[PDB]
Amino acid sequence: IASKTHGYVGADLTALCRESVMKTIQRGLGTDANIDKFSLKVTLKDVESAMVDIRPSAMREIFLEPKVYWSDIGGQEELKTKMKEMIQLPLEASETFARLGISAPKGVLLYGPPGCSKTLTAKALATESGINFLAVKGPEIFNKYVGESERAIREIFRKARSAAP
Amino acid sequence: KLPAEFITRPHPSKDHGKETCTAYIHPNVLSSLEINPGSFCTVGKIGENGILVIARAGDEEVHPVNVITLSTTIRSVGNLILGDRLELKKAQVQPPYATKVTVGSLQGYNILECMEEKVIQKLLDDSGVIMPGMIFQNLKTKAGDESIDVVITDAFYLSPPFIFRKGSTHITFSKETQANRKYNLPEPLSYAAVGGLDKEIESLKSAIEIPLHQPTLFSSFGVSPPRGILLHGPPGTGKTMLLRVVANTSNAHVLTINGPSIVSKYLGETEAALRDIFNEARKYQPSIIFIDEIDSIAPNRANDDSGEVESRVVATLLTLMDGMGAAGKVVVIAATNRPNSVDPALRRPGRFDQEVEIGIPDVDARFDILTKQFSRMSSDRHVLDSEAIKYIASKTHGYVGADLTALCRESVMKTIQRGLGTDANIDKFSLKVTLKDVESAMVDIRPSAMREIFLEMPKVYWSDIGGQEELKTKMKEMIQLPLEASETFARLGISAPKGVLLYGPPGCSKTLTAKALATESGINFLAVKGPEIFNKYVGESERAIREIFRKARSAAPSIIFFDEIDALSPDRDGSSTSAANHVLTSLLNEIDGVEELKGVVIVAATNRPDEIDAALLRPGRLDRHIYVGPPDVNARLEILKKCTKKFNTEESGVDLHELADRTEGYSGAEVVLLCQEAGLAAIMEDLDVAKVELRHFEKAFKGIARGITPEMLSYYEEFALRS
Amino acid sequence: FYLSPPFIFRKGSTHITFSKETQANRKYNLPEPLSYAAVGGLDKEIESLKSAIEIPLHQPTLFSSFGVSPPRGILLHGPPGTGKTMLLRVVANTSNAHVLTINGPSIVSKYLGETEAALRDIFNEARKYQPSIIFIDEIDSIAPNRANDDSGE
Amino acid sequence: KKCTKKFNTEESGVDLHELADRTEGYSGAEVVLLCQEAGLAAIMEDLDVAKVELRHFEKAFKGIARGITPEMLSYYEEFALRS
Amino acid sequence: SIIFFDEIDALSPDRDGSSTSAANHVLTSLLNEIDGVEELKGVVIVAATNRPDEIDAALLRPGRLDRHIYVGPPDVNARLEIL
Amino acid sequence: VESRVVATLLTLMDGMGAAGKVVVIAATNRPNSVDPALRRPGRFDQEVEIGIPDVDARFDILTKQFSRMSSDRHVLDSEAIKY
């Protein structure tokens, strides 16, 4: 249920539980003709029905977080090794960089043919690594924010900087 | 003190006789009005020429000064719902003796219990009787179970007072559903009046009964059941009627927010009134709060930054409503014309989570509404069988139901005017109501809600299409599986196609095939016009897409059809506009996204895929392709079969095979145009003709041209090969 | 009627029974106080809030000796429905210090000096007692941006 | 292999090497689409089916197209060489 | 009644000189008013244009403004009669 | 509450005598938003401009703050403050 509760938040979860309880009560009243509520209990099917019935009120989120492992991608392990040991150094070997010197690469470019799995590989790496991951879609933020795009960019950058590497 | 208004409460005492025709008024009020206890008191609902003379006076200090109790026996006549203000008048008239009285029965049973001991014992205690015939629960029917209600119809002033004495007058037994119409007595609203919203009314009844009648269950559950119900829909759908009927059918207290009347120039007056009404609702356990036109009372704070009489009232009402205890049984009802203008704070699923959606009635719902209206109307004043009502409902599509009431009223006006004009004030019994007058009124007045978010195209069967059944079978096996075999898909894994693209030459029957499949399937069908949403709304197109998608998701799995999508993606030809990019990205992130979207199936039709960007045509979205090209010989022959069946064929000297062979290069629209031209040519000579000759067909064929070039067909073929 | 009817206790008339219950009977509709375990999933945030309330309140002498102007305002910002009001209610219930809240629009009236007088009175009351906590809800509605809206009424 | 793990493989009558050889010109999204089409073709025959044959896979491969032209690949390669 | 338009070429400028929002709005309005759910039996629509080149192809479809009249220059008889 | 206040402030400032040793000083975040009548060099001719302190000024402020805090509660060298 929690995995299928990505969009809901707090009061949304409470409203979903309340809707599930209401659906259970209504189903019991309709079927068993006012039977004792002790035996009605709560079923996962009713929870799913309530979740379908009422959508989250916070669907529009500035940052988007699904967990996926390395078994799903099934890559050559060459690109996987590249992604594993090109960006792990700046986040973990900060002291090594400080003592040795030089500057971090601080940049990754992913260009490829359409229909590839760059996003899937990035999500798998983010799930495998313990570092916090923030993903924001490009066209969906600057298109509808003629002047608020700068504010959103500053907000996401400062949130990423403050909330750990 | 000077109490301008009084509140109403039922009598705690049981049984009948003692509780009826009695009042519980504080002695201080009676002393100010110098009303003797052995006199008659008049109560009126804020006026409306109401008198309602009743006997006896109040006693005991247990009740507050403002509250006055007169039981529901009298309130059932003048529709004196709980919470209505009452007025006391000093003037009174001594009732005279009644005569030639009669008694009826609300139920089907007529003339039962002639001894009527309960009625007989009521004779001695009948003081201050009134003509409208107080409705009694009848208690126990002296074996036989059930209960029979009694009503008296015959016995300036709304109801003339009378004195009932045994022996002087004779009681007559009869049966009538309601009172006589010559006395213009109000008719209480019942659930039978509301029709076409059985699911909606059932949901409202459940959402009212659960927190009110059984609050202890949720109190033990510790869930804090919601106290706010939102009814959002187009105007004229009977939301006010629903609010009124749910109040009438419920014995709990009813409180209605006036809105603008409550709001005054004083800043604290609104807060004081809201606090007073909330305290009154909380003091008595059974009570229902009604807020008519919540949108006007509580507008969007973000849209309009008005802190004068908008922000403060919203804040205070939300704080008061959030602060009530869970053990109480109080329900707040809010009705709005549009949910978008409602403030998002009130739309948060913490205060108004329970939302009831009311839409435009479909064919069966409209037919049910018409039948209910005709049954409510006197049956002897009109004759209309089932087929006539079905035809009227089919011809009635843009009307909302207030439009239906207006149509009925205009039909009555037209019938009266025609009768007086023609027959020179004849008796209205013979005039009756004719379908021709109804059609004339329908032509006269256009629907007030023609602009609709979704269009319900009347049903069409497979016989009209007359296809080769190959494309029909393909569509049957394509999109029916994700709608019915969801469990099979889950067992087998993978994902649903969740997309169908209908690209073909202009003048085809892709829309006709989609409509026929929607008619054949029992699943709900939703249709959206392409150019009618994004072009009209430069910025509101995104909100329209959001609301239509959420409505489709909520109202069960369904198939959505778009007439045109080529104009929806002009990002490649003639530059890219902000609205075009917005609608394109909305379509993309709705078709593919975090949501699995299994039940929802999207079908898109376009005139040419040239105006469609390659982003839309990607694997996993609209992958399936249908040629839906021009009809073949069999389809043209079968569609010409209907035309040949319309008139006589054997003596017309035409053969189906030769007609199909000659007209092989035309499409269905071209075939229909040729048939229409041939029919017009045939009927132009010798006026009406029972048959059409082949010369007319040849003239129609030579006069008109198909207008289709082979290059576009080759382009479509190579696009299909490329895809 | 009555939230809780009064009772009279005397020896011998009634017999005392020993049991164990987390709360009282549900039929008495008594409000249930919210504890720390009521809210979950915000361990870091709740720990930060706990430190930010404990250090200035329980240990004012250390910062007075430091003279580093200890902070007095704690800002809780986030999407609606996250549970900020729950944190405020929990910290109000679990703290024995004085609790004061501002209605906001209700306090604001047509008189320009009435709001100022009410604010002066409420902060004077807060300063009268050494342990005090001030709660303000919907500051943006009460005090919007001056640059965005040029309304000084 | 991950896609076919849902059902059996012993009685499917398909070999791993030829499946990769035939679908060499496709991509991961194309492979997923082909698998979905093959599953749909299998389930539209004889109602529910517990297995899928090679004929369904061949039909799905024939019906669908990769939709990618080598000029984009050459442009990407020359951009990579330039960068 | 019969509805006659003095000019209709300027009503569909969507093909020449770009496509303004108002032009598209009026074009779709006339289109869905001429053809729609309403039968529109008594109402007759007559369209007049100086040059049919400025008319969009989507307007010229069967069932909508299909009938065409050459209405060319008058002959010697008509010219004599009007003279 | 703006034009009248500005006008009366200007009148009062112009009415101050030379003998009287009365001075009025005000602080503003932005000088551009200030009314140019006040900015005219007849009532507010003297102006004190404070900009962004450089590294040396910041270092001096930090050293002064740490000296006020006193070393009994912290230990740091000049290199740390400079960094």
Residue numbers in the entry:
A (entry chain F): 445 to 509, 511 to 610
B (entry chain A): 29 to 183, 209 to 776
C (entry chain F): 209 to 361
D (entry chain F): 694 to 776
E (entry chain B): 611 to 693
F (entry chain E): 362 to 444
What text does the study give?
The cryo-EM map of Drg1 hexamers treated with ATP/benzo-diazaborine was resolved at a resolution of 3.8 Å (without symmetry imposed). Notably, compared with structures from other samples, this structure is more symmetrical at both the D1 and D2 rings, and the six protomers are roughly in a same conformation. While the six D2 ATPase sites in the structure of the ATP/benzo-diazaborine dataset are fully occupied by ATP, the six D2 sites in the structures from the ADP/AMPPNP/benzo-diazaborine dataset are not saturated and appear to be partially occupied by ADP. Benzo-diazaborine is docked in equivalent sites of the D1 and D2 domain. On the D1 domain, benzo-diazaborine is surround by I422, T458, R297, and R429. Importantly, benzo-diazaborine contains an extra benzyl group, which is coordinated by R429 through a cation-π interaction. Therefore, benzo-diazaborine should have also formed covalent bonds with the 2′-OH of the ribose of the ATP molecules in the ATPase centers of both the D1 and D2 domains. While the NTD and D1 remain largely as a rigid body in all these comparisons, the D2 domain of the Drg1-ATP/benzo-diazaborine complex displays a distinct conformation that is dissimilar to any of the six protomers from the mutant Drg1-ATP complex. These results suggest that benzo-diazaborine has locked the ATPase centers of Drg1 in a specific conformation and limited its conformational transition. In summary, benzo-diazaborine blocks the ATP hydrolysis cycle and hinders the conformational changes of the D1 and D2 rings, thereby disabling the conformational cycling of Drg1 subunits required for substrate processing.
